[model samples]
Target: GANKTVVVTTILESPYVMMKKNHEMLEGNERYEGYCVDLAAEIAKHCGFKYKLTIVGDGKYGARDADTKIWNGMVGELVYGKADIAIAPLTITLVREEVIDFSKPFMSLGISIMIKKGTPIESAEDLSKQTEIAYGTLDSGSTKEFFRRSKIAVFDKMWTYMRSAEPSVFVRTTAEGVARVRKSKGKYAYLLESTMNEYIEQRKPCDTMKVGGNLDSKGYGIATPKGSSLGNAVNLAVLKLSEQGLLDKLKNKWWYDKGECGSG
Candidate 1:
C-alpha cells in the first residue's frame, strides 16, 4: 500500500475548491487551492497516505438515477472505485449515505435564498404565490433534489412552478445561478446552501444578499466508499481538527479574513 496513492474527487465550488490565481505555472496538487485543498492536506497527513486530487468528470456532487438505480458525479467516482474518497462541499444526505460513507460534518449549513438586494421575495412561500421573478436551484445537487422531493406545501408548490416554468429555471452551477440573480436585477432569485450564499454576499460588487433564514438544516462532509479502510481514519481526522479549533481557523481564513464586504 506504500506505493498506492489515494484518488480524491472534488468539485470547483469557490471557498471549497478553486483554481489558484497563478495555477497556470503550478503542477499537481499545487495547481489548485481552497478549503478542501487545505483540508485534504491535513487529512493526508493524519492518515499517513499520499493522494492525487481530481475534479469529478461529470461535474456534479452526486445523484442517483431513479430509473436505472445508478449513481453519478463524485458519488459515482467513489461508488465505482474511480476515486478512493471525495473532499469538497458535498452534502451528507440520507440517499447518499445509503450508498457510501460520510465523515463527521465539517461544516453546518442550510438552503437559503440569494437575491439581488431589494427583491420583494422573502420566503419560498412568497415566491410560490407570485409570478413576476423566476427562481431555481443548481440542477444536479441536493438543493434541487430537496425541492423536487419536498412534501411541504410551500416547497411543493415552488417545485411545481419551477418544473413547469416555460424557459426552464434550473441552473447547472452555483456560479451560473448567482450570475442569474445579479443579472436579473430583482427579477430572479437563486436558492442555494447558506454557506455559499454567505460567501458570495461578501464578494466584490456586493449587490446581492442572502434573504430570509435557511429553509432546512444540513452539513457538509468528507465522503468515502462504503466500507472504505480510510473511513474511520478520515472521521477521526475531522473530529481531531474540530476539537483543536482548526476547522474554525480554516473558516475564518477563507471566509472572513479575505472577505471584501463590510459587516453591517
Candidate 2:
C-alpha cells in the first residue's frame, strides 16, 4: 500500500518455499508461496509492517571458505545489507550469530545421512566404522559447516571421515547431494537435514532412508540485520504463532499430510 518494502531473502526449497505454478498471474506477495510465506504474513501482521519476499541472489546461503575465511548467502544478505531480513532455514551457528541478530529458533533439526536402501548402513556409528561406503554433504550449508566446526561425539567422528575421504566425496548444493545419493549404487551417501531426508523418502525411486538420528542439535531462526528495530517484534511473532499451534499445523500440512500415505 505504501513505498515501504522489507526486503526479505529466502530459498526455494519445496514444502518450505516455492513459487506457485500460476505465479506469473499473481501480483506482488501473491506470487510467492510456502510455509515461510504464510509465517512471513503473520509476522508482518503482528509487527505492523509490509514486506516483499524474494530469494537470495547468491544460491549459497552459508558456509566457511577454507582459504577466503569469509561467509555468504542469506547471512551475507544481512551483513552486507542486501536484504533487511531473512526467514530462510539459516542455521544458528556461532559464527553466523556473531554477525547477524537471530530470533529464537523457529524449528529444530539435525544432520543425518541419506542413503539408498539396502546400503547396509543403519546408524551414525556405521557410517564412521564402515570402509566400503562414502558420504559427504552440501559444501556451504549448515551440514558442512556443522561438521567442520563441531566438538561433539558423533560429529567429531564424522568430521574425521569427511575431512579425509578418498575421491573427495562430492557436492556443491543440496539438490546435487540428494541426487548423488539417489543415483549412486549404494556406494555414496548424502548428509543433510532430517526434514528433507523424510520428504524424499516417500518420493519416486523410494530407495533412500535417513540412517541413525541427528548428529548435532540445531535449529532455524529468522535473521535480521543487527540492531534492526524489527527484531523484538519478529521474535514475539514467532513465539505467538508457535503458542497458537500454527507452526505445528503448518508442518503437518506441508509434510505428514501431503506425503504418500495422505494422513495418519
Candidate 3:
C-alpha cells in the first residue's frame, strides 16, 4: 500500500549520515541529511516506499557479539526485524554476508592509514618496524579484526606489537583515534577506511593526511535482511542509481563541492 512506511537504519558517520544544523526546527527525516539521506531518498523513489530514517541506537556499523552469538547495531536491527533495510556506509564483508544480504556495492573502499600531517610514517610496514610511533585500529570493528586475524607477516607483526603496547593502543571511536593522532604530534597513527580518511582530510583544520595505499579492498553496500520481500527491489534500485551516475554525483556533492581543502 502507498501508506506503508519502510524503516531504514543508518549511522551518524560524516558525509554519510549527519544531523542538520537546524535540526531542532525540522521534524522527522527532515532533521537529518547527508550522502545516505540522499541515497535513501533515491532508493525510496525507485522502490516506491515511504521511509522513516532511524539512526541505530548503538553507533556501531555492525558486529556479532562473541559471548552471546547475537548481532548488534544495524545488522542486529535487520536480523531481528527492527528495520526493513539499511542504507549507510556499512561494509560488505563475508561474515556479514552469512547473516544478511547486500546489494551491489555503492562505494569501493579499503583500510588505510590516517596520519598527522608530515608524520614520518609512510606505510604500515614502516610503523611495524619502529618504536618511535604508536598506532592502532578502531576498537571492535572490521579494521581491528583484520589486523588481529591477519596472516600477512607485516600486519601480523604490527598486530602483535599493538596487542601489547604500553598505555593501550586501541581506541573506542574513530574520532578518538583521530584526536590521538593530532595530539600525539607524530607519535600516533590511525588505521581506518580510506573513504572516511579522505573525507576527513578534505575537511576544515585539515591537519591529517591518508598515507600509503589501502591495506585491503572492499566496498560499502545497501543491506537487507535474509530473504526480505524488498531485497530484489532494493538491489535493483542501487544498480539503477549507479548506472544513472547519481551515486558519483552525490559523492562529489558531499566530498568535493563542499570540501574545505583547496583543489589538488
Candidate 4:
C-alpha cells in the first residue's frame, strides 16, 4: 500500500458529518460537509498528509460483536487495516484503546439529558424517579453500553426499566432518538452525546434542550491502529492545536457559530 492515499474513515451525520444539501449532484468529498469535515481539513493540513474521506461502511462508531467477536464500524475498519486512520467523533474508551490508538482528546464531551424544550426535567435524578416520562439511549454506542454495564445504582436502575419497557425505549440511531424526543410531546427524554444534543438545541425549530450539565465526562479522539507510525505525530499535532486554542476555535466555528439558535 505504499504511495496509497490515506483512507480516512468517518461517519455521516449532522454537525459532525452531513451530506451536503446538493449531495445528489455532488461527488466525493464535495458531497460532504460538517464539523468533522472542517476538522479533517485542519488536521490534514497540519499533519501534512494526502487523505481521502470514506464513511465507515457499517455506519457505526465501532463495537466488538458479542455475536461474532469481530469488530464493526470505524474501529473495525482501522483494526482490519481497511482504513489508514479514523477521524470522527469517535470516543475514547478503555476497550477501544486496547485494539487501536487514540490521540489526545480532540473534543471533550459528556453524556447529556436531551428533552423537548420547556420540559420540567433538570437532572438524571428527575428522570430516574418519574413514571410519566419515558427515557432511553441510542441503541448501539458507548452511552447505552455505559448504562448497561455501570455499577452505579441509578444508572443500573434506569437501564433495568429501559430493558423492560414494553415498547422498548432504545433507539437505533441518534436521529431517531432526537426525533422521538421532538415528537413525544414531553413524554420522552433521550440520553445522548452532549455534542449532538447541543447542536440540535441550536438548530432551527430548536425545540430540544440539553440539561443538568454532563452526567459523566469523556471525549472523542482520532484513532489509528495499534503501534501506528501515524499515531505519535497525530498526538503531537492535537496537543499543539489544543495549546494554540484551535480546538476550541473549531468547536465554535462548527457548533454555536453556525447554528440558527442564539445563545440563551
Which tens-of-lDDT digit does each residue in 152-178 have in candidate 2?
777688888888887777587677877
Q: Write the per-residue lDDT of candidate 3 for residues 1-264, one digit (tens) a residue.
A: 125889999988888989999899899899998999999999999999899999998877777888999988899999999888999988898889999999999999999999999999899889889998899987657887788889999999999999999899988767898889889998899999998998889877789999998999999999999998898998899999999999999999888745466765
Q: Sort by lDDT, best first: what order?
A: 1, 3, 4, 2
Enumerate residue pairs that collide in model 3.
Answer: none
Which candidate tops lDDT? Answer: 1
**Which pairs, if any, clash in model 2?**
none
In candidate 2, how many Å is residue 247 off?
0.4
Candidate No. with top TM-score: 1
Q: How high is the lDDT of residue 250 in model 3?
A: 95
lDDT (10s digit) by residue, model 4, range 1-264: 448578899997778898888799988778899888888888888888978889989788888888888998899999999998999999898889999999999998899999998889999889888889999987667898888888788888888888799798988778999999999999999999999888888887888999897978999999999998889888988899889998888888777545466664
Angstrom error at residue 252, model 1: 0.7
TM-score of each: 0.96, 0.91, 0.94, 0.93
Residue 163 in model 3: lDDT:
93
**Model 4 RMSD to the real structure?**
1.9
TM-score quality measure for candidate 3:
0.94
What lDDT score is found at residue 131 in candidate 3? Answer: 90
User: What is the C-alpha local distance difference test score of candidate 1?
Assistant: 0.92
> Residue-wise lDDT of candidate 1 within 32-112, one digit each (tens)?
889999999999999999999999998998888989988889999999999999999999998899999999999999999
lDDT of each: 0.92, 0.81, 0.89, 0.88
